[PDB]
A paper describes a structure:
Homologous recombination (HR) is an essential double-stranded DNA break repair pathway. In HR, Rad52 facilitates the formation of Rad51 nucleoprotein filaments on RPA-coated ssDNA. In S. cerevisiae, Rad52 is an important pro-HR mediator and Δrad52 strains are defective in various recombination processes including Rad51-dependent allelic recombination and Rad51-independent single-strand annealing. The primary DNA binding activity and the oligomerization regions are harbored in the N-terminal half.
Thus, to establish the stoichiometry, we performed single-particle cryo-EM analysis of full-length S. cerevisiae Rad52. 2D classification of Rad52 single particles in cryo-EM analysis confirmed that yeast Rad52 is predominantly a homodecameric ring. 3D reconstruction and subsequent refinement revealed strong density for the N-terminal half (residues 54–143). However, only partial density was observed for the C-terminal half, which is consistent with the disordered properties. The final cryo-EM map reconstruction reached an average resolution of 3.5 Å with local resolution ranging from 2.9–6 Å. Using the refined map, a de novo model was built for the N-terminal region encompassing amino acids 54–143. The second is the presence of extensive positively charged regions on the outer perimeter of yeast Rad52. Several 2D classes show the presence of extra bright density adjacent to one part of the decameric ring. The data reveal an interesting structural feature where only a small subset of the C-tails interact with the decameric ring of Rad52.
Author numbering:
A (entry chain B), B (entry chain C), C (entry chain D), D (entry chain E), E (entry chain F), F (entry chain G), ...: 1 to 90
Amino acid sequence: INLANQIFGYNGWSTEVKSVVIDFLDERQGKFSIGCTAIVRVTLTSGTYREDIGYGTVENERRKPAAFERAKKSAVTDALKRSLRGFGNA
Amino acid sequence: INLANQIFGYNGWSTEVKSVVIDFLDERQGKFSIGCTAIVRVTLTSGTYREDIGYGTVENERRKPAAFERAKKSAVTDALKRSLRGFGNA
Amino acid sequence: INLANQIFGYNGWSTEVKSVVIDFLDERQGKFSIGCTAIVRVTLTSGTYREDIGYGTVENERRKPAAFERAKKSAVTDALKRSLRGFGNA
Amino acid sequence: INLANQIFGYNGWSTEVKSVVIDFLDERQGKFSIGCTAIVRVTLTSGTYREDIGYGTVENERRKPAAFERAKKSAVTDALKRSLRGFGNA
Amino acid sequence: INLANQIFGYNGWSTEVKSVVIDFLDERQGKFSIGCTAIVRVTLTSGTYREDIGYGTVENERRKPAAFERAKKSAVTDALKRSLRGFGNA
Amino acid sequence: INLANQIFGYNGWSTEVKSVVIDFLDERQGKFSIGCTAIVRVTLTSGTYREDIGYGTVENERRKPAAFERAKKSAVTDALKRSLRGFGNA
Amino acid sequence: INLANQIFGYNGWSTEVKSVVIDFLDERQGKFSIGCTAIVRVTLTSGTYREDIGYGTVENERRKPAAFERAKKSAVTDALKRSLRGFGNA
Amino acid sequence: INLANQIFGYNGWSTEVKSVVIDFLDERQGKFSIGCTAIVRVTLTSGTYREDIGYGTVENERRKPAAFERAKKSAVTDALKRSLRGFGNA
Amino acid sequence: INLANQIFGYNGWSTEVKSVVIDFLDERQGKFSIGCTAIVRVTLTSGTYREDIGYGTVENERRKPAAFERAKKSAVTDALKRSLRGFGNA
Amino acid sequence: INLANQIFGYNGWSTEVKSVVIDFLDERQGKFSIGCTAIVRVTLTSGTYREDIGYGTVENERRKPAAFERAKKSAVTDALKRSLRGFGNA
């Protein structure tokens, strides 16, 4: 993630999470196999964006952190997917 | 997709997903046959937009990654359809 | 479709799929006879727009590819309706 | 329609279908008597719009997609209604 | 209506149908007695406007053109009501 | 009503029917005793708006023009109430 | 109300009825004891507003003008409440 | 309230009633013990704005002026809370 | 609260209660243990806004002022949470 | 959070809680295990924004401050994730 804040400047690239929505909710023998779709929209200092969508899922999560960490992995998967789409080296 | 970044500038073309919708969900013998339609937008450096619409489907997906890669691959095929429709070589 | 990119410049005309809506869904003998209507508004550089409506239909599509095909054919019909509606030769 | 492109310029008038709605749906002995109401808004190069309301109908069309052409005829008769209301010869 | 196009410039007055609503629906011995209220706003070239509303009703219409000409007569009656409301001779 | 067009210029004052709302509906022995509240807003050439509310009610109307003249009379009495509020003599 | 037109100019003080809501409806021995709440904002020529809220109620109204004079009296008393709020003598 | 009109100018301080919400309704032995919340803002001639909420409650109000106190006393106490919040002496 | 007006200018800060919401309603033998969530946004004269979220609760309140607790507990808690977040001494 | 006020100026960064929503509510042996997601958006003086989401959970909270603590500490965890994502040292 810091590689992005390294290719662009400390005030070069921005983030605006459009929508983060739940896909399903499971209760099978206490397992919570749930996923989420997140759409972040980066904005370089040149006013060029790269909106995309990423997914984040968790399988068992008995303690009920299934809604805890799914959000962060989904959001960071989308940040990685934006770099995959463009700005691979610049 | 990288060819689009090659033909345009590194800050020449953009992407604005505005409509990701899942149409049907199946439960047949555990298999999930689901589809998704994605509509994106592009603010080109010259301010021209080749909006379009793409579709992606998955047949069995026993582990339920059906809702996982449907969105990503629908978005990528719709971005490909954007090149297919307009900007054939430029 | 490429003739539109030819009679105009590579950045001459635009496209904005305003509304794609499906009308019905059939299951008679496992056949899916479904049709959708789509509205688009191409935009010339001068700013003139041409809004239309286009309908795309499929008859049997037993393995349910209808949703995949309906959008593409509706968009193609919509664009042809634009071409006949205006800018026939310029 | 081409006569309108003749009196005006190739980039003189516009078109905007913003309200296309379906009043009823009949299945009398398989026949589909359905109608639709469409509202267009043409815009001259001088900026003087002209918005009216046009209606179309179909009587039998035992083919299930009787919705295929209703929109087209409603829109064209609504454009004809715009021609009738104003700009009769210019 | 052509008298309005005569007193005003061909590009002098404009028109936009704000709302077109259906009051009721009757099925008495197959006869349809239905009415609509239409609100249009006209706009002179000087920027002044004259909003008003009009009503159009049909009694029997056994063929069911009851929804066919109700809208046209409502819009016509309401433009006439605008003419009587203001711009009587200029 | 014409006195308003006389004290102001033909292009001095305007009118904007903001909202017409039907309070109730009656069916007693076929008689329709119904009313409506119309809120119009006028605008002088000096940009001084005068918004108000008026009401028109019918008592019997066996033929059912009860929804026909209620709206027009309500709009008229509200336009009159606007003059009662301000612009009495100017 | 005319005193407000006297203290200010003929085009100095404006009115904008923003929210008229009736809270309840009674049918007790046919008598209608109903109330209405009206919120309007006035505007001086100096671009200073003075928003408030007033209430108009009626008790018996056997003829059912209960919905007739409620709005008029609510708007009147709310304008009076604006006068009490500010512009007491100017 | 007049002290506010004294500390600032006659056209220096404004009022914008934003949200009046009725909390509940009581019918106990005909007594109406009801409360209301009013959110208003004031605007100073310098462009600064103070926004707050105020609550008004009534216990018995056998005659049912309970809704009458909503329009007056809740707004009054919220306006007082605005002065409490700021501009205590200037 | 007055200390914030003291470090700031008399017209330097602003308050905007964005959202006051009820969380729950409890009726325990007359007790009302309810809490409310208030999000307010402040704005300094330098155009530097600062949003946050505050909470205010009441335990027994047999007299039912449990709804009025707001602007006296919850909103002032948000005013204090904003002060804690930033502008600790300036 | 004060460290952010140290690296940036007293009027350098901002905060805007765009959406806080509670995920679930548990009533197990009186204990409440609830979670909340908050989306804040910091804004630097240079018009650069870190939009992000964070989560806050509470397990037992028998007294029911569960809806009280989560709102504050989830927003705090998410403002911390702001620094975790960007502006590591500046």
